Amino acid sequence: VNDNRPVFVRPPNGTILHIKEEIPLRSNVYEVYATDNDEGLNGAVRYSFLKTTGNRDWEYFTIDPISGLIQTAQRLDREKQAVYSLILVASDLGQPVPYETMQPLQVALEDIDDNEPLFVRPPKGSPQYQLLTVPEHSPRGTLVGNVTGAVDADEGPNAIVYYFIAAGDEDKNFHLQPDGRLLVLRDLDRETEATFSFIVKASSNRSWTPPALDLLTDLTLQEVRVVLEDIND
Ligand SMILES: [Ca+2]
Ligand SMILES: [Ca+2]
Ligand SMILES: [Ca+2]
Ligand SMILES: [Ca+2]
Ligand SMILES: [Ca+2]
Ligand SMILES: [Ca+2]
Ligand SMILES: [Cl-]
Ligand SMILES: [K+]
């Protein structure tokens, strides 16, 4: 007679497992262990995921029915999905029906630095540069505006974004702070030169410097255009 139900020993109920994202196929994740103190088959334990809920996170993993080893079955990308919900099942092999026990388990992916700062180009047809405007004859240091649009898909210190002029301001009309603040250096006159164009690099490298620059293919770059607003002078 099948007296005992299997009892999970590991993991503990409600534990959130933390693994690195982007670990290769069939990487080892966890050793599940449940015990059953019954005689022979009534006390043999077999491991599975529950696959009958609407939650299909089980597709990312396998569990060995005998050893309880969970391995990865697919790419684990934290930027695609950060948390994965599994329901562990431990079954004995009882007479016409086994007793089974279930234990929810969450797996959370720790971020790695596998993305760089990238712009997204305005839709085809509309101008491909970020536009900034300043009054002509603005004094030295005047905020022209904030260059922006570059995002790093990583987390915290893996997602630092800095902006740098890559090319196009040989006259030193502007200074670009690494935070994206674009400032006036020189006296700018609408009635002489009313428009400026140059290229900015977004980088996580605080000490990036210019080294051939293709704005169609390289989304770490964008064009910035500055126009001077009219003063009555
Ligand atoms: Ca049993
Ligand atoms: Ca990733
Ligand atoms: Ca990054
Ligand atoms: Ca990442
Ligand atoms: Ca003027
Ligand atoms: Ca004017
Ligand atoms: Cl204007
Ligand atoms: K402005």
PDB file of C-alpha atoms and ligand atoms in Angstrom:
ATOM      1  CA  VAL A   1       0.000   0.000   0.000  1.00  0.00           C
ATOM      2  CA  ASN A   2       1.245   3.561  -0.914  1.00  0.00           C
ATOM      3  CA  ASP A   3       1.312   5.256   2.562  1.00  0.00           C
ATOM      4  CA  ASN A   4       3.613   8.316   1.923  1.00  0.00           C
ATOM      5  CA  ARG A   5       3.518  11.214  -0.605  1.00  0.00           C
ATOM      6  CA  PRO A   6       6.925  12.584  -1.870  1.00  0.00           C
ATOM      7  CA  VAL A   7       8.280  15.574   0.143  1.00  0.00           C
ATOM      8  CA  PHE A   8      10.478  18.248  -1.502  1.00  0.00           C
ATOM      9  CA  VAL A   9      13.852  18.669   0.239  1.00  0.00           C
ATOM     10  CA  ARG A  10      15.335  21.140  -2.303  1.00  0.00           C
ATOM     11  CA  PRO A  11      14.690  23.721  -3.347  1.00  0.00           C
ATOM     12  CA  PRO A  12      12.872  25.339  -0.350  1.00  0.00           C
ATOM     13  CA  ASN A  13       9.271  26.555  -1.212  1.00  0.00           C
ATOM     14  CA  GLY A  14       9.272  30.137  -2.639  1.00  0.00           C
ATOM     15  CA  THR A  15      13.070  30.316  -3.335  1.00  0.00           C
ATOM     16  CA  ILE A  16      14.030  32.525  -6.297  1.00  0.00           C
ATOM     17  CA  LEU A  17      16.981  30.911  -8.121  1.00  0.00           C
ATOM     18  CA  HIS A  18      19.469  33.455  -9.623  1.00  0.00           C
ATOM     19  CA  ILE A  19      21.506  32.322 -12.698  1.00  0.00           C
ATOM     20  CA  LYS A  20      23.460  34.416 -15.253  1.00  0.00           C
ATOM     21  CA  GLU A  21      21.636  35.172 -18.545  1.00  0.00           C
ATOM     22  CA  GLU A  22      23.066  33.835 -21.911  1.00  0.00           C
ATOM     23  CA  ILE A  23      24.516  30.619 -20.367  1.00  0.00           C
ATOM     24  CA  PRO A  24      24.908  28.016 -23.123  1.00  0.00           C
ATOM     25  CA  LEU A  25      22.465  25.176 -24.013  1.00  0.00           C
ATOM     26  CA  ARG A  26      22.240  22.263 -21.507  1.00  0.00           C
ATOM     27  CA  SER A  27      23.952  24.334 -18.710  1.00  0.00           C
ATOM     28  CA  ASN A  28      23.196  22.918 -15.193  1.00  0.00           C
ATOM     29  CA  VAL A  29      20.659  25.101 -13.273  1.00  0.00           C
ATOM     30  CA  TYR A  30      19.638  23.108 -10.146  1.00  0.00           C
ATOM     31  CA  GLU A  31      19.477  19.579  -8.591  1.00  0.00           C
ATOM     32  CA  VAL A  32      15.847  19.022  -7.468  1.00  0.00           C
ATOM     33  CA  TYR A  33      15.484  16.421  -4.612  1.00  0.00           C
ATOM     34  CA  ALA A  34      12.333  14.950  -2.986  1.00  0.00           C
ATOM     35  CA  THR A  35      12.142  11.765  -0.791  1.00  0.00           C
ATOM     36  CA  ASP A  36       9.434   9.061  -0.368  1.00  0.00           C
ATOM     37  CA  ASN A  37       9.896   6.530   2.503  1.00  0.00           C
ATOM     38  CA  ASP A  38       7.582   3.847   0.934  1.00  0.00           C
ATOM     39  CA  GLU A  39       8.712   0.304  -0.122  1.00  0.00           C
ATOM     40  CA  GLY A  40       9.910  -0.216  -3.760  1.00  0.00           C
ATOM     41  CA  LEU A  41       7.850   1.548  -6.515  1.00  0.00           C
ATOM     42  CA  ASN A  42       5.486   3.346  -4.042  1.00  0.00           C
ATOM     43  CA  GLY A  43       8.796   5.045  -2.928  1.00  0.00           C
ATOM     44  CA  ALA A  44      10.563   5.568  -6.324  1.00  0.00           C
ATOM     45  CA  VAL A  45      10.611   9.357  -7.149  1.00  0.00           C
ATOM     46  CA  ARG A  46      10.252  10.840 -10.694  1.00  0.00           C
ATOM     47  CA  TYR A  47      10.672  14.579 -11.500  1.00  0.00           C
ATOM     48  CA  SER A  48       8.699  16.700 -14.093  1.00  0.00           C
ATOM     49  CA  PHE A  49       7.512  20.279 -14.788  1.00  0.00           C
ATOM     50  CA  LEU A  50       3.740  20.877 -14.740  1.00  0.00           C
ATOM     51  CA  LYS A  51       2.849  21.750 -18.402  1.00  0.00           C
ATOM     52  CA  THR A  52      -0.990  22.128 -18.134  1.00  0.00           C
ATOM     53  CA  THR A  53      -1.107  25.814 -16.856  1.00  0.00           C
ATOM     54  CA  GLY A  54      -1.161  28.717 -19.343  1.00  0.00           C
ATOM     55  CA  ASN A  55       2.510  29.444 -18.341  1.00  0.00           C
ATOM     56  CA  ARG A  56       4.965  27.955 -20.927  1.00  0.00           C
ATOM     57  CA  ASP A  57       8.251  29.051 -19.170  1.00  0.00           C
ATOM     58  CA  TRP A  58       8.955  25.247 -18.941  1.00  0.00           C
ATOM     59  CA  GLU A  59      10.026  25.433 -22.658  1.00  0.00           C
ATOM     60  CA  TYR A  60      13.335  27.111 -21.605  1.00  0.00           C
ATOM     61  CA  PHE A  61      14.392  24.130 -19.384  1.00  0.00           C
ATOM     62  CA  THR A  62      14.501  20.278 -19.122  1.00  0.00           C
ATOM     63  CA  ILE A  63      14.337  18.242 -15.862  1.00  0.00           C
ATOM     64  CA  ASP A  64      15.795  14.721 -15.781  1.00  0.00           C
ATOM     65  CA  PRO A  65      13.028  12.407 -14.440  1.00  0.00           C
ATOM     66  CA  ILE A  66      15.554  10.267 -12.417  1.00  0.00           C
ATOM     67  CA  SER A  67      18.339  12.667 -11.244  1.00  0.00           C
ATOM     68  CA  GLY A  68      16.166  15.826 -10.801  1.00  0.00           C
ATOM     69  CA  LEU A  69      18.779  17.878 -12.775  1.00  0.00           C
ATOM     70  CA  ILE A  70      17.316  21.010 -14.444  1.00  0.00           C
ATOM     71  CA  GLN A  71      19.277  22.144 -17.545  1.00  0.00           C
ATOM     72  CA  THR A  72      18.628  24.982 -20.034  1.00  0.00           C
ATOM     73  CA  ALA A  73      16.848  23.941 -23.263  1.00  0.00           C
ATOM     74  CA  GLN A  74      16.853  27.396 -25.044  1.00  0.00           C
ATOM     75  CA  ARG A  75      18.607  30.771 -25.057  1.00  0.00           C
ATOM     76  CA  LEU A  76      17.998  32.695 -21.787  1.00  0.00           C
ATOM     77  CA  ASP A  77      18.016  36.461 -22.632  1.00  0.00           C
ATOM     78  CA  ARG A  78      17.225  38.774 -19.654  1.00  0.00           C
ATOM     79  CA  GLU A  79      16.430  41.526 -22.240  1.00  0.00           C
ATOM     80  CA  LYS A  80      13.756  39.140 -23.687  1.00  0.00           C
ATOM     81  CA  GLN A  81      12.384  37.759 -20.363  1.00  0.00           C
ATOM     82  CA  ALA A  82      13.957  38.350 -16.925  1.00  0.00           C
ATOM     83  CA  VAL A  83      11.846  35.922 -14.716  1.00  0.00           C
ATOM     84  CA  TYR A  84      10.691  32.331 -15.499  1.00  0.00           C
ATOM     85  CA  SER A  85       7.973  30.497 -13.488  1.00  0.00           C
ATOM     86  CA  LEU A  86       8.195  26.652 -13.195  1.00  0.00           C
ATOM     87  CA  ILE A  87       6.063  24.215 -11.189  1.00  0.00           C
ATOM     88  CA  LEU A  88       8.214  21.254 -10.005  1.00  0.00           C
ATOM     89  CA  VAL A  89       6.402  17.864  -9.667  1.00  0.00           C
ATOM     90  CA  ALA A  90       7.714  14.833  -7.750  1.00  0.00           C
ATOM     91  CA  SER A  91       5.736  11.571  -8.314  1.00  0.00           C
ATOM     92  CA  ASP A  92       6.113   8.048  -6.944  1.00  0.00           C
ATOM     93  CA  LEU A  93       5.176   5.068  -9.168  1.00  0.00           C
ATOM     94  CA  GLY A  94       2.136   3.851  -7.078  1.00  0.00           C
ATOM     95  CA  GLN A  95      -0.165   0.894  -8.060  1.00  0.00           C
ATOM     96  CA  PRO A  96      -2.781   2.248 -10.617  1.00  0.00           C
ATOM     97  CA  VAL A  97      -2.258   5.932  -9.417  1.00  0.00           C
ATOM     98  CA  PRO A  98       0.871   7.600  -8.033  1.00  0.00           C
ATOM     99  CA  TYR A  99       0.889  10.305  -5.275  1.00  0.00           C
ATOM    100  CA  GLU A 100       2.562  13.552  -6.530  1.00  0.00           C
ATOM    101  CA  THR A 101       3.664  16.846  -4.878  1.00  0.00           C
ATOM    102  CA  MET A 102       4.142  20.232  -6.650  1.00  0.00           C
ATOM    103  CA  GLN A 103       6.372  23.186  -5.662  1.00  0.00           C
ATOM    104  CA  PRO A 104       6.461  26.525  -7.582  1.00  0.00           C
ATOM    105  CA  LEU A 105      10.038  27.691  -8.431  1.00  0.00           C
ATOM    106  CA  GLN A 106      11.076  31.085  -9.959  1.00  0.00           C
ATOM    107  CA  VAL A 107      14.365  31.502 -11.934  1.00  0.00           C
ATOM    108  CA  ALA A 108      15.599  35.137 -12.276  1.00  0.00           C
ATOM    109  CA  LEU A 109      18.345  36.032 -14.798  1.00  0.00           C
ATOM    110  CA  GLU A 110      21.251  38.171 -13.492  1.00  0.00           C
ATOM    111  CA  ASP A 111      22.194  40.813 -16.176  1.00  0.00           C
ATOM    112  CA  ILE A 112      25.494  40.607 -18.145  1.00  0.00           C
ATOM    113  CA  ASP A 113      26.916  43.503 -20.216  1.00  0.00           C
ATOM    114  CA  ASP A 114      25.919  42.091 -23.644  1.00  0.00           C
ATOM    115  CA  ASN A 115      24.321  45.260 -25.146  1.00  0.00           C
ATOM    116  CA  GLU A 116      25.762  48.646 -26.166  1.00  0.00           C
ATOM    117  CA  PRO A 117      24.121  52.100 -26.402  1.00  0.00           C
ATOM    118  CA  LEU A 118      22.020  52.283 -29.654  1.00  0.00           C
ATOM    119  CA  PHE A 119      19.886  55.025 -31.260  1.00  0.00           C
ATOM    120  CA  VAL A 120      16.599  54.247 -33.104  1.00  0.00           C
ATOM    121  CA  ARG A 121      16.356  56.113 -36.445  1.00  0.00           C
ATOM    122  CA  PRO A 122      13.265  58.271 -37.042  1.00  0.00           C
ATOM    123  CA  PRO A 123      10.860  56.636 -39.589  1.00  0.00           C
ATOM    124  CA  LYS A 124      11.832  56.755 -43.331  1.00  0.00           C
ATOM    125  CA  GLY A 125      10.654  60.064 -44.920  1.00  0.00           C
ATOM    126  CA  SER A 126      11.151  62.239 -41.759  1.00  0.00           C
ATOM    127  CA  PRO A 127      14.567  63.858 -41.036  1.00  0.00           C
ATOM    128  CA  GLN A 128      17.115  61.306 -39.709  1.00  0.00           C
ATOM    129  CA  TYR A 129      18.933  63.778 -37.350  1.00  0.00           C
ATOM    130  CA  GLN A 130      17.966  65.034 -33.885  1.00  0.00           C
ATOM    131  CA  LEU A 131      17.185  68.810 -34.262  1.00  0.00           C
ATOM    132  CA  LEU A 132      18.385  71.333 -31.642  1.00  0.00           C
ATOM    133  CA  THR A 133      17.791  75.153 -31.662  1.00  0.00           C
ATOM    134  CA  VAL A 134      19.513  78.061 -29.809  1.00  0.00           C
ATOM    135  CA  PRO A 135      19.163  81.886 -30.055  1.00  0.00           C
ATOM    136  CA  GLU A 136      22.076  83.322 -32.138  1.00  0.00           C
ATOM    137  CA  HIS A 137      24.586  85.411 -30.061  1.00  0.00           C
ATOM    138  CA  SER A 138      23.809  83.262 -26.912  1.00  0.00           C
ATOM    139  CA  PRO A 139      26.677  83.601 -24.363  1.00  0.00           C
ATOM    140  CA  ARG A 140      29.381  80.931 -23.759  1.00  0.00           C
ATOM    141  CA  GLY A 141      27.980  77.847 -21.921  1.00  0.00           C
ATOM    142  CA  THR A 142      24.289  78.408 -23.023  1.00  0.00           C
ATOM    143  CA  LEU A 143      22.428  75.037 -23.174  1.00  0.00           C
ATOM    144  CA  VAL A 144      21.632  74.472 -26.910  1.00  0.00           C
ATOM    145  CA  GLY A 145      19.733  71.367 -25.696  1.00  0.00           C
ATOM    146  CA  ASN A 146      20.101  67.709 -24.566  1.00  0.00           C
ATOM    147  CA  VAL A 147      21.294  65.190 -27.155  1.00  0.00           C
ATOM    148  CA  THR A 148      19.450  61.959 -26.314  1.00  0.00           C
ATOM    149  CA  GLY A 149      17.883  58.848 -27.936  1.00  0.00           C
ATOM    150  CA  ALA A 150      20.608  56.246 -27.109  1.00  0.00           C
ATOM    151  CA  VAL A 151      19.499  53.364 -24.796  1.00  0.00           C
ATOM    152  CA  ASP A 152      21.581  50.442 -23.386  1.00  0.00           C
ATOM    153  CA  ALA A 153      19.240  47.419 -22.850  1.00  0.00           C
ATOM    154  CA  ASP A 154      21.430  46.117 -19.935  1.00  0.00           C
ATOM    155  CA  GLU A 155      20.999  46.964 -16.177  1.00  0.00           C
ATOM    156  CA  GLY A 156      22.531  49.524 -13.758  1.00  0.00           C
ATOM    157  CA  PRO A 157      26.343  49.802 -14.256  1.00  0.00           C
ATOM    158  CA  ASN A 158      26.110  47.699 -17.506  1.00  0.00           C
ATOM    159  CA  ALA A 159      23.804  50.385 -19.053  1.00  0.00           C
ATOM    160  CA  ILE A 160      25.826  53.662 -18.677  1.00  0.00           C
ATOM    161  CA  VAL A 161      25.273  55.945 -21.741  1.00  0.00           C
ATOM    162  CA  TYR A 162      27.751  58.775 -22.642  1.00  0.00           C
ATOM    163  CA  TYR A 163      27.596  61.109 -25.710  1.00  0.00           C
ATOM    164  CA  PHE A 164      30.635  62.374 -27.703  1.00  0.00           C
ATOM    165  CA  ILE A 165      31.119  64.398 -30.947  1.00  0.00           C
ATOM    166  CA  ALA A 166      32.589  61.755 -33.365  1.00  0.00           C
ATOM    167  CA  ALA A 167      33.115  64.234 -36.302  1.00  0.00           C
ATOM    168  CA  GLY A 168      31.800  67.486 -37.826  1.00  0.00           C
ATOM    169  CA  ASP A 169      32.531  70.337 -35.350  1.00  0.00           C
ATOM    170  CA  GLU A 170      36.116  71.342 -36.524  1.00  0.00           C
ATOM    171  CA  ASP A 171      35.232  75.043 -35.735  1.00  0.00           C
ATOM    172  CA  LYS A 172      34.680  74.192 -31.977  1.00  0.00           C
ATOM    173  CA  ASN A 173      31.269  75.996 -32.049  1.00  0.00           C
ATOM    174  CA  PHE A 174      29.902  73.646 -29.323  1.00  0.00           C
ATOM    175  CA  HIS A 175      31.002  71.502 -26.356  1.00  0.00           C
ATOM    176  CA  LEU A 176      29.088  68.259 -25.771  1.00  0.00           C
ATOM    177  CA  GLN A 177      29.119  67.173 -22.090  1.00  0.00           C
ATOM    178  CA  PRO A 178      29.186  63.363 -21.746  1.00  0.00           C
ATOM    179  CA  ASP A 179      25.629  63.579 -20.195  1.00  0.00           C
ATOM    180  CA  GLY A 180      24.259  64.912 -23.563  1.00  0.00           C
ATOM    181  CA  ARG A 181      24.146  68.661 -22.648  1.00  0.00           C
ATOM    182  CA  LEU A 182      25.245  70.563 -25.833  1.00  0.00           C
ATOM    183  CA  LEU A 183      26.692  74.027 -24.948  1.00  0.00           C
ATOM    184  CA  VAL A 184      27.621  77.187 -27.010  1.00  0.00           C
ATOM    185  CA  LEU A 185      31.423  77.966 -27.060  1.00  0.00           C
ATOM    186  CA  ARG A 186      31.647  80.638 -29.854  1.00  0.00           C
ATOM    187  CA  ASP A 187      29.655  83.707 -31.056  1.00  0.00           C
ATOM    188  CA  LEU A 188      27.001  82.318 -33.460  1.00  0.00           C
ATOM    189  CA  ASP A 189      25.414  84.688 -36.032  1.00  0.00           C
ATOM    190  CA  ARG A 190      22.185  83.703 -37.916  1.00  0.00           C
ATOM    191  CA  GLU A 191      22.963  86.182 -40.752  1.00  0.00           C
ATOM    192  CA  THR A 192      26.335  84.376 -41.521  1.00  0.00           C
ATOM    193  CA  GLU A 193      26.013  80.632 -40.596  1.00  0.00           C
ATOM    194  CA  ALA A 194      22.531  79.661 -39.309  1.00  0.00           C
ATOM    195  CA  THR A 195      22.833  75.821 -39.390  1.00  0.00           C
ATOM    196  CA  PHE A 196      25.382  73.213 -38.106  1.00  0.00           C
ATOM    197  CA  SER A 197      25.583  69.439 -38.601  1.00  0.00           C
ATOM    198  CA  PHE A 198      27.891  66.915 -36.856  1.00  0.00           C
ATOM    199  CA  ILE A 199      27.857  63.251 -35.748  1.00  0.00           C
ATOM    200  CA  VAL A 200      27.585  61.969 -32.135  1.00  0.00           C
ATOM    201  CA  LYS A 201      28.747  58.612 -30.766  1.00  0.00           C
ATOM    202  CA  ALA A 202      26.858  56.957 -27.848  1.00  0.00           C
ATOM    203  CA  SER A 203      29.253  54.748 -25.829  1.00  0.00           C
ATOM    204  CA  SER A 204      29.532  53.112 -22.356  1.00  0.00           C
ATOM    205  CA  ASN A 205      33.281  53.985 -22.549  1.00  0.00           C
ATOM    206  CA  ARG A 206      33.829  57.217 -20.500  1.00  0.00           C
ATOM    207  CA  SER A 207      37.222  57.786 -22.320  1.00  0.00           C
ATOM    208  CA  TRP A 208      35.968  57.109 -25.912  1.00  0.00           C
ATOM    209  CA  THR A 209      37.746  59.276 -28.587  1.00  0.00           C
ATOM    210  CA  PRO A 210      37.365  59.622 -32.394  1.00  0.00           C
ATOM    211  CA  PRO A 211      39.370  57.079 -34.490  1.00  0.00           C
ATOM    212  CA  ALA A 212      34.809  56.060 -42.500  1.00  0.00           C
ATOM    213  CA  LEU A 213      31.475  56.787 -40.611  1.00  0.00           C
ATOM    214  CA  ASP A 214      28.285  55.149 -42.026  1.00  0.00           C
ATOM    215  CA  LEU A 215      25.037  56.488 -40.406  1.00  0.00           C
ATOM    216  CA  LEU A 216      22.893  53.916 -42.386  1.00  0.00           C
ATOM    217  CA  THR A 217      24.397  50.797 -40.678  1.00  0.00           C
ATOM    218  CA  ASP A 218      25.973  52.082 -37.345  1.00  0.00           C
ATOM    219  CA  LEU A 219      23.164  52.882 -34.818  1.00  0.00           C
ATOM    220  CA  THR A 220      25.807  53.759 -32.148  1.00  0.00           C
ATOM    221  CA  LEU A 221      25.972  57.104 -34.107  1.00  0.00           C
ATOM    222  CA  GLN A 222      23.388  59.802 -34.955  1.00  0.00           C
ATOM    223  CA  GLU A 223      23.469  63.099 -36.823  1.00  0.00           C
ATOM    224  CA  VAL A 224      22.737  66.237 -34.786  1.00  0.00           C
ATOM    225  CA  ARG A 225      21.685  69.438 -36.508  1.00  0.00           C
ATOM    226  CA  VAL A 226      21.737  72.871 -34.772  1.00  0.00           C
ATOM    227  CA  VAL A 227      19.787  75.877 -36.181  1.00  0.00           C
ATOM    228  CA  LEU A 228      20.002  79.490 -34.802  1.00  0.00           C
ATOM    229  CA  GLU A 229      16.710  81.170 -33.736  1.00  0.00           C
ATOM    230  CA  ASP A 230      16.368  84.779 -34.988  1.00  0.00           C
ATOM    231  CA  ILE A 231      17.226  87.702 -32.662  1.00  0.00           C
ATOM    232  CA  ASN A 232      16.274  91.239 -33.816  1.00  0.00           C
ATOM    233  CA  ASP A 233      19.967  92.510 -34.091  1.00  0.00           C
TER     234      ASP A 233
HETATM  235 CA    CA B   1       4.854   6.914  -1.914  1.00  0.00          CA
HETATM  236 CA    CA B   2      20.965  39.406 -23.146  1.00  0.00          CA
HETATM  237 CA    CA B   3      25.727  47.536 -21.844  1.00  0.00          CA
HETATM  238 CA    CA B   4      22.220  42.048 -20.549  1.00  0.00          CA
HETATM  239 CA    CA B   5      22.980  88.276 -36.167  1.00  0.00          CA
HETATM  240 CA    CA B   6      18.779  88.267 -36.610  1.00  0.00          CA
HETATM  241 CL    CL B   7      13.490  81.299 -35.406  1.00  0.00          CL
HETATM  242  K     K B   8      17.236  74.979 -27.374  1.00  0.00           K
END
